[PDB]
């Protein structure tokens, strides 16, 4: 820390702060020269050759060590100059770490570390473990033993294998028992690791060229965070490793990250460790301190120094944060411990440092390094204490340029890795065997199910004084700030003179676990091609080959010029074809555009709330479609969901949650009323444990894969930009030889381009990916955990209601409100807040937009997507469709069901995901289309359409002559039904043979409500209905319809696990109305080329008629619209009356024949088997324009274009649908009628236009198109 005096290697040895140290090693050891950069921190610029006897050889091994990176140089750090530079650098980084709030705290705990005084000399005595000091040679040839705390030596054989090294004890775990021991950090500030980014692009649009460098400060900070854990004897056993599955062509051959490694990194990595294992360690170390206090509390004397036993007892007092009374006895304050621990453990972590140093760095310990570099930090022009490489001013500070080894090329010297490229690998063969050498450190992670401990099954007794939950403070920069203020920076252990030790202190390193070499080669003969194969087929041989030509098909990896793409053929074409230099730059522009073009394709799929943004070429870039129902990725993903992306499917074991036992209290109100609260509280806490648990499983099994792909794609895109830089190149590589011609093709600028083109591409691919992650979590992992909680919740309620009962008379004036409190709480879940377990601004931001759409909420949502009737909410397991089930050809999401026992659709919901307390509070909605009842059979005959019962298992939708019903019924067969009844004796009905939006709400504690088209039609209490069954499957089929020609049309069926409120209902309702598409009088999309009868909503008793064809003729509303009937059944005004209307395309045609909100069209009037053209003369007299049916060829420049409408300019629905316009583009007006001497001719008046803005009064322009429909038995006269 800080380091007071600036050293030089040659500066004269002086017995203190600069001496000839004799580290505690084995056997003899010529003394070595080390400096004292600070109280308790020495620096030896030698290669660690002393610490380990079996490590004096600094030469590389004929066999390679299984690590992604390695580097050797027998000669490094030999000269006396190299030492000085090493001295100058190790320092500058301590100053770097020290210049940060987080840094500052850590170096104060490290210097304060001080290995406990074990040396167990007689219980009651204190003493120094000689292995924690060093002998210091004084000038007069003498030597005085000195206590040490942390030492930095040079690397051993493998220069970049930095790590913590401590000497062990004959019978003590000085690193895992609380004692702590002097640490020797093998580190070098002359080499670094290069890594690659594929996320920061979101915040940095012009992110660096390629591989970035790792600020040496972080690496050193990472290693100290380790000395910290060990100094406080809190290091996790290195026998604790996150097990990894290896047998599989996609799995990593070998790799064993330690918990103490996932701990030290922090970020999410540290979240891979389950809660149960987390608290396992805490108590473990919390008891190591308790013994430290005991050990101290009974220490009478102290052999060794001339320092007061009190002084000593105090150092360790101030170290472990012990508390002592007036007698001087020590104790471990639990609450004060949890803090110290929380600091050494979660505040001081690599991720947290990457915040203080504002540098770019790996975002996970599982992001394997791909390089080594020779850097030189000493010169200020290169690296500064405050800015590092990203120097102030210098063009390095805009986008971590200083860290980009390509941009800041001058500061990084690419060295030779010593692990080839295929040292550790896997052999993957297709089905010409067709195999590939896939790199080990290039395959999937894949955690073993073992790692995830749990313990969620243990039940629990709930007394009155149980201890309630505790937050999950995500360690925000604010919390660190707090720790900083309350941080104690004054006073640092004194250099307590100890009595000389052996001239040669006997060492022997702590024993690390053995390196189990892993198998290599391992062959894999597969069926389908792999994402690895496809990726492979996009690299192509360096360059001395023949001008390669891009070419689809995986066989694109059989020719020496093996290259493949996922781009449109035309690109292949433009690239694969000679281009005369006369015309070359054009080509460049072309490709670039086309590249940045093909590379940015994004599907909106708005009609799919869940995964919005979509990058289609992913499927054919990594062969992700996983081969399903043949191609069409964007359709593939929609049919399955983000599952189609996982190289492997993770499971979720959420045991049958235990239960709370309730300790009862005899005639003790307080103590009782307090137990129920503890019960409910622990239950709330109970839900948190489950959620937090699946987020750990989701963080390592799922989210990790998606991230590998995230890299894979970024890899792909570059493989493409690299070839289109090869091809284009080969061309100009055979240039005309004419200088001054073109400001150079600038390969180092076409690239500056292709860079951006890809950087943005990743911004899209990333959003898309983030959605498949969050989304996969919400519909494939949470539902499971919830089921068990909801169960637990359903149980606890009884156990609680009973408790209250069994204790009434003691809960005298409260046996109701407590009965209400327990019934009111345990009647709704505990929302899943992702922010409670994740800081990631990326994913939370995602999670937020996902939550906004109430549809992603539904436990069942089935639309007709792509080419299937699927359950987008991923709850259904098998949706069996009948044979007599028909799907409207236009909007196939409109299902029609007949009376035939062969037309039916049955849906079964995954059992594991279904809890029986599921239909207490829940809603259901769908769109209905009921034909008209013509016969009398229909009378008093109630057929059922939707049924969900398991022997009296409530709710099933039924129909009966002019009314819709919803009946709830419990096992105790008690039933309750709510009904909406619609009369069939009306001129014009709002429900007959039309579409009706229906929503049914259910609140166990209240009533059952029925909403028709948004408004509440009726409600009936249900606070008396007993328990209800949860049917595993729902059946769509009519049942008991005596009518032979009865049928219905359903649409947008959904099922919600909560009581939708008025607002939600109305929102949901406006959303499923497709306001951008005009409608049939019955609700279907209006259509081009399809004769409709006009019904004027203002004067429903008349009907359009063409007085006389021609401009000298007119159209008007004719006399009395006839009636229709069938005594004792219906009496509706007739519809199929008057002249028909035909809408003709005019703007954007050939496409679907659906008429959309703002289409310009043509209205052909069909007069006497012939079709004419409704037009007018915009040069008439008044505001009104009479309109006539002209001869299509005689119309000419007369006003005829009509702008169809559906949403008022303001945005409100209006019936006024036809706005006529003059060719100049003007606005002649909406079409309506108008009295002209008691004749009311159809007219286009600019009046309505004005009114439609103000009010919303049904006007003379309120038209309605009526096609003939099998639902309206009426016969077109
Ligand atoms: Zn480490």
From Swiss-Prot:
Keywords: Cell wall, Disulfide bond, Host cell membrane, Host cytoplasm, Host cytoplasmic vesicle, Host membrane, Host synapse, Hydrolase, Lipid-binding, Membrane, Metal-binding, Metalloprotease, Neurotoxin, Pharmaceutical, Protease, Secreted, Toxin, Transmembrane, Transmembrane helix, Ubl conjugation, Virulence, Zinc. Belongs to the peptidase M27 family. It comes from the Bacteria. Changing residue 1137 to E: Decreased binding of RBD to SV2C, substantial binding to neurons. Changing residue 1245 to A: Reduced toxicity, heavy chain has strongly reduced binding to synaptosomes, heavy chain binds less GT1b. It catalyses: Limited hydrolysis of proteins of the neuroexocytosis apparatus, synaptobrevins, SNAP25 or syntaxin. No detected action on small molecule substrates. Changing residue 365 to A: Light chain has 40% cleavage activity on SNAP25, 30% decrease in Zn(2+). One of its GO terms (molecular function) is toxin activity. Zn(2+) binds at residues 222, 226, 261. GO terms for cellular component: extracellular region; host cell cytoplasmic vesicle; host cell cytosol; host cell plasma membrane; host cell presynaptic membrane; membrane. Residues 432-851 are annotated as: Translocation domain (TD). Residues 1074-1277 are annotated as: C-terminus of receptor binding domain (C-RBD). Residues 473-526 are annotated as: Belt. The gene is botA. Binds 1 zinc ion per subunit. This is Botulinum neurotoxin type A. There are seven antigenically distinct forms of botulinum neurotoxin: Types A, B, C, D, E, F, and G; new subtypes are quite frequent. Types A, B and E are the most frequent cause of adult human foodborne botulism; type A is the most severe, while type E has the shortest incubation period. Changing residue 265 to A: Light chain has 50% cleavage activity on SNAP25, no effect on Zn(2+) binding. Toxin internalization is inhibited by azide or dinitrophenol or at 4 degrees Celsius. Dynamin (DNM) inhibitors abolish toxin uptake. Changing residue 26 to A: In strain: 62A. Heterodimer; disulfide-linked heterodimer of a light chain (LC) and heavy chain (HC). Interacts with glycosylated host synaptic vesicle glycoproteins SV2A, SV2B and SV2C which serve as coreceptors. Glycosylation of 'Asn-559' in SV2C contributes a 12-fold increase in affinity to this interaction. Depolarization of target tissue with high levels of K(+) leads to greater levels of receptor exposure. In vitro addition of gangliosides increases SV2-toxin interaction. PROSITE patterns: ZINC_PROTEASE. A ganglioside GT1b (d18:1(4E)) binds at residues 1098, 1184. Residues 1233-1234 are annotated as: Interaction with host ganglioside GT1b. Residues 852-1073 are annotated as: N-terminus of receptor binding domain (N-RBD). A motif (Host ganglioside-binding motif) lies at residues 1245-1248. Changing residue 1099 to A: Decreased binding of NTNHA by RBD at pH 7.5.
